Amino acid sequence: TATLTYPFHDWSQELSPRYAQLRASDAPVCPVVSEGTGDPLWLVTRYATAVKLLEDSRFSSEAAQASGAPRQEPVELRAPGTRGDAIAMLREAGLRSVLADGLGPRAVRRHQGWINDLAETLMSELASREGTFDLAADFVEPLSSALVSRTLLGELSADERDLLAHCADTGLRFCGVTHEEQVHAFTQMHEFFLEHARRLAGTPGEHLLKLIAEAPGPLSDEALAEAGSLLVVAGFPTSSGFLCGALLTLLRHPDAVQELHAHPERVPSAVEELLRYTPLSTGSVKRMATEDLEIDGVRIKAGEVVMVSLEAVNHDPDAFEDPDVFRPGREGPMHFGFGRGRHFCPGNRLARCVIEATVRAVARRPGLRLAVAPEEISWHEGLFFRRPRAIPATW
Numbered sequence: 001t002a003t004l005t006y007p008f009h010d011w012s013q014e015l016s017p018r019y020a021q022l023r024a025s026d027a028p029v030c031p032v033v034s035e036g037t038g039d040p041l042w043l044v045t046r047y048a049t050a051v052k053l054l055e056d057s058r059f060s061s062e063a064a065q066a067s068g069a070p071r072q073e074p075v076e077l078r079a080p081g082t083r084g085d086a087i088a089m090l091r092e093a094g095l096r097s098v099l100a101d102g103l104g105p106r107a108v109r110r111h112q113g114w115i116n117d118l119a120e121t122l123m124s125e126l127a128s129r130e131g132t133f134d135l136a137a138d139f140v141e142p143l144s145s146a147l148v149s150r151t152l153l154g155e156l157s158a159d160e161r162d163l164l165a166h167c168a169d170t171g172l173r174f175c176g177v178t179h180e181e182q183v184h185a186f187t188q189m190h191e192f193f194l195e196h197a198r199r200l201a202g203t204p205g206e207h208l209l210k211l212i213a214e215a216p217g218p219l220s221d222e223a224l225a226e227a228g229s230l231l232v233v234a235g236f237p238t239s240s241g242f243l244c245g246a247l248l249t250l251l252r253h254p255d256a257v258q259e260l261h262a263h264p265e266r267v268p269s270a271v272e273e274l275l276r277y278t279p280l281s282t283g284s285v286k287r288m289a290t291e292d293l294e295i296d297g298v299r300i301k302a303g304e305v306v307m308v309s310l311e312a313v314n315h316d317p318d319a320f321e322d323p324d325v326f327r328p329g330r331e332g333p334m335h336f337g338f339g340r341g342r343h344f345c346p347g348n349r350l351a352r353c354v355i356e357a358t359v360r361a362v363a364r365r366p367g368l369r370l371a372v373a374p375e376e377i378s379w380h381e382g383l384f385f386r387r388p389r390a391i392p393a394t395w
């Protein structure tokens with residue numbers, strides 16, 4: 001119909017041109033309709049409006065996650081009949097900030113050493129390869145797998161890692177699998193943690209699941225299972241998608257990489273520019289109005305859901321001059337790659353650490369290049385978190 005359906009099917013790094021058109025329109029909030037559910041939704045694409053939305057206490061993230069809320073995703077992201085309320089269930093047990101605690105600066109200082117070791121080990125193995133090699137399979141996959149085992153869940157079997165990864169790729173989708181396959185993904189994940197979370201949390205290590213389980217009524221197995229599913233969904237396809245996308249951005253900008261090779265102290269700024277420039281989610285961050293309000297003049301009624309596309313905001317020319325240029329020296333406002341306000345990614349420091357290690361491993365080795373044109377890269381169509389099927393590269 002004449003109301004836009006959402007999302008915009010921009011599964012590659014080419015952002016849908018619709019986002020810029022909506023940004024330039026006379027509306028600061030645009031009504032859309034969910035393709036997967038038919039629910040009405042509002043969509044924000046301007047940086048200035050997005051700041052107002054994500055800093056407004058009248059907009060609730062948790063209320064937008066509740067069953068029956070208008071939503072963009074085709075299937076509810078919980079096992080049927082369960083809360084799907086992991087952060088609140090941790091808060092209920094007295095686990096104030098266990099998430100941010102176990103992912104903050106002290107955790108980076110524990111893990112950054114082996115993270116950089118592993119990035120170097122992986123890249124050094126690639127430096128010995130002939131012909132074309134795959135940076136997705138042979139760099140991003142082992143690095144992200146080690147990240148999830150060592151920092152989030154505990155030492156996983158290869159079969160366990162393969163299983164959780166498949167559940168993430170199957171359930172976190174707008175399309176490409178059946179309804180039944182999508183629910184079975186969130187079923188199989190929840191069933192998986194109900195049985196194995198206690199054992200995983202009990203092994204020696206610093207992993208977040210152990211911290212959650214071993215912090216001060218006892219922690220129910222349903223809450224520990226909800227925490228496991230939370231860490232997979234929030235930590236696994238995001239890190240793997242982003243690292244793949246960041247590598248593509250670097251390979252597409254050899255002049256920038258040459259600068260980082262010569263001046264490695266500029267890597268942290270390049271990390272921030274990657275977080276702004278490289279797209280990740282194909283949907284949007286969402287919030288529910290808990291009372292009638294106006295945002296930039298547009299009246300929103302209690303119960304309505306307003307979305308912000310982080311990609312659209314990160315490419316807003318009102319915020320970032322030449323927004324479609326990858327400019328590591330950039331000194332613009334804070335990017336939205338980790339969101340904004342109360343729900344700012346609590347994994348942001350760990351993510352920055354793994355991104356930095358990846359950038360350094362690339363910048364240290366001149367000659368790395370994409371083996372084919374960018375438009376020939378194949379993409380997993382329909383994922384919430386963009387990811388190419390492979391990244392063929394050569395020296």
Ligand code: HEM
Nearest residue numbers: 231234235238239242285286337338339343345346347351
């Ligand atoms: C490059 C990697 C990552 C990116 C780009 C990213 C991005 C984001 C963004 C944009 C949000 C805000 C969502 C919103 O406002 O509704 C968020 C929230 C969150 N992130 Fe990250 N993330 C990454 C990695 C991770 C990792 C490794 C973890 C580890 C578990 C993690 C855990 C979380 C959690 C639990 C939330 C929910 C916070 C809340 O709703 O209050 N993230 N992330």
Ligand SMILES: CC[C@@H]1NC(=O)[C@H](Cc2c[nH]c3ccccc23)NC1=O
Nearest residue numbers: 061065077086087172230233234384
């Ligand atoms: C993480 C699960 C849960 N659900 C939410 O809608 C928000 C936003 C969010 C952050 N990371 C995601 C990965 C996949 C889907 C949604 C999200 N916060 C939550 O904690």
Ligand SMILES: CC[C@@H]1NC(=O)[C@H](Cc2c[nH]c3ccccc23)NC1=O
Nearest residue numbers: 072073238280281283284285286384
């Ligand atoms: C539509 C299905 C799913 N629902 C969400 O709430 C998150 C919000 C979000 C936007 N960009 C991100 C990057 C990393 C982690 C979370 C997010 N995105 C989704 O795609």
